[PDB]
Ligand binder design. Structure first.
Ligand SMILES: C[C@@H]1O[C@@H](O[C@H]2[C@H](O[C@H]3[C@H](O)[C@@H](O)[C@@H](O)O[C@@H]3CO)O[C@H](CO)[C@H](O)[C@@H]2O)[C@@H](O)[C@H](O)[C@@H]1O
Ligand SMILES: [Zn+2]
Ligand SMILES: [Zn+2]
Ligand SMILES: [Zn+2]
Ligand SMILES: [Zn+2]
Ligand SMILES: [Zn+2]
Length: 428
């Protein structure tokens, strides 16, 4: 049980005679590093060795490698709310839960994000960004085809048929072969793939109920040309999203900043809209986001400073402002100083990039509608492996996503059983 209190954390910042060196690994270096530099300017006794680990997939592999070796482990490591679980459960991350941290830091982060940095009763990071889904819509393409900005999945299907019949070089959307992209869609329609009761007790529902109905719908979209299966955040995707291959793109809202940075030619052409409803339920959403975690290997005498750094970077009012100023005037932060500020909710676009200037209001409404009735499995790294091996190959116009989900569930059941988890599935 961690005895580093909220007061001990604050003392690491005030006790400036106690010099500390922290090694920090991050994959979102572009967005985060300027605010890291601001930390170092403000607290020169805490020196940050900031390591840009490149792409997230490489970062997580590198971190697992050093943890398994028990050598050369960073003190602080970027995590995300749907990838940290297997690191937390395996003991790679410091569980810094205690009453005083819980009491103090729970007030600093919006409740949806704060819940998600817990796992199995431990506390494993400070939330960084929230990532409510938004639908980035090429309004120019829809206008050309006399199509409305879609508000539901039913609209995506019916309008997507018309679009692709009239212009077979464009699709209404992409079904991205990425575990976050894919699970975000299920979460955003209230379709549980699984339920976690405790660290060693899980239920898989990948082939029944609302999940099965949604999978059937996605396969019909693939079969009929409404969605195209493909990768996201690859060169293939980058070409497509620049060329207008997808009239809609339903994604975590950090993409809103990515378009401003990588796609200047799309200025004025997109509207940012709410993600779609399903079956005449009110629309729901999903938020994941990054978090900053401390390694279990972090030396005891550096832990207070490591926690002080993660809390400062992710919640200090100056830090939150830096996140805005260094990311085109907006970055969607989980800290309550951002989330509870009506002027962030009503913040108007000033750069002319999106065709609607109320982008943050769309993001905030989506955040309000995040589906919190959800947990990630303890072995999310294995989930991603099985997804790549079993589900991704079926994401095509002749695929069988329904059958693939059932086979993936069987593989995850065997993995769970082999690793000491109690597991039920809807196939039992
Ligand atoms: C790993 C993801 O972390 C969160 O998303 C962050 C987003 O991550 C992207 C990486 O920067 C990129 O290298 C590659 O791995 O794609 C990732 C998206 O899946 O990066 C932005 C900045 O551009 C933010 O830092 C996001 O927090 C999380 O929300 C995702 O679901 C993933 O777990
Ligand atoms: Zn150093
Ligand atoms: Zn708690
Ligand atoms: Zn067209
Ligand atoms: Zn390629
Ligand atoms: Zn400050």
């Amino acid at each position: 049980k961690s005895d580093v209190t909220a007061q001990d954390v604050e003392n690491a910042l005030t006790d400036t005679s106690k010099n500390v060196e922290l090694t920090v690994w991050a994959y979102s270096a572009k967005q985060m590093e300027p605010t890291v530099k601001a930390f170092e300017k403000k607290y020169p006794h805490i020196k940050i060795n900031f390591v840009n680990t490149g792409a997230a997939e490489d970062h997580f592999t590198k971190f697992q490698n050093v943890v398994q070796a028990q050598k050369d482990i960073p003190d602080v490591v970027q995590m995300s709310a749907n990838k940290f679980q297997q690191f937390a459960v395996s003991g790679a991350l410091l569980n810094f839960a205690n009453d005083s941290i819980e009491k103090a830091w729970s007030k600093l982060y919006t409740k949806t994000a704060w819940a998600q940095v817990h796992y199995a009763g431990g506390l494993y990071g400070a939330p960084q960004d929230a990532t409510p889904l938004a639908n980035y819509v090429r309004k120019d393409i829809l206008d050309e085809h006399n199509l409305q900005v879609p508000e539901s999945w039913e609209d995506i299907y019916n309008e997507g048929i018309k679009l692709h019949k009239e212009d077979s070089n464009k699709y209404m959307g992409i079904l991205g072969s990425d575990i976050s992209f894919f699970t975000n869609l299920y979460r955003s329609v209230g379709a549980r793939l699984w339920k976690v009761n405790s660290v060693d007790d899980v239920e898989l529902t990948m082939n029944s109920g609302k999940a099965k109905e949604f999978t059937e719908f996605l396969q019909k979209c693939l079969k009929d040309g409404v969605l195209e299966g493909g990768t996201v955040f690859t060169d293939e995707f980058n070409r497509s999203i620049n060329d207008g291959r997808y009239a809609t793109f339903i994604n975590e809202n950090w993409m809103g900043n990515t378009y401003k940075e990588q796609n200047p030619s799309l200025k004025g052409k997109m509207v940012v809209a709410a993600p779609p409803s399903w079956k005449g339920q009110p629309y729901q959403s999903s938020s994941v986001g990054s978090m900053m975690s401390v390694s279990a290997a972090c030396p005891k005498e550096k832990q207070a400073a490591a926690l002080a750094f993660i809390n400062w970077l992710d919640s200090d009012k100056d830090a939150i402002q830096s996140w805005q100023d260094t990311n085109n005037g907006n970055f969607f932060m989980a800290a309550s100083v951002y989330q509870d500020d009506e002027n962030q909710r009503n913040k108007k676009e000033t750069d002319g990039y999106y065709a609607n200037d109320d982008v943050n209001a769309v993001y905030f409404d989506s955040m309000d509608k995040v589906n919190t009735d959800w947990e990630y499995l303890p072995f999310m790294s294995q989930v991603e492996v099985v997804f790549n091996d079993v589900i991704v190959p079926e994401m095509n116009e002749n695929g069988d996503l329904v059958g693939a989900m059932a086979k993936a569930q069987q593989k995850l059941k065997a993995y769970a059983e082999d690793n000491g988890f109690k597991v039920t599935t809807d196939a039992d």
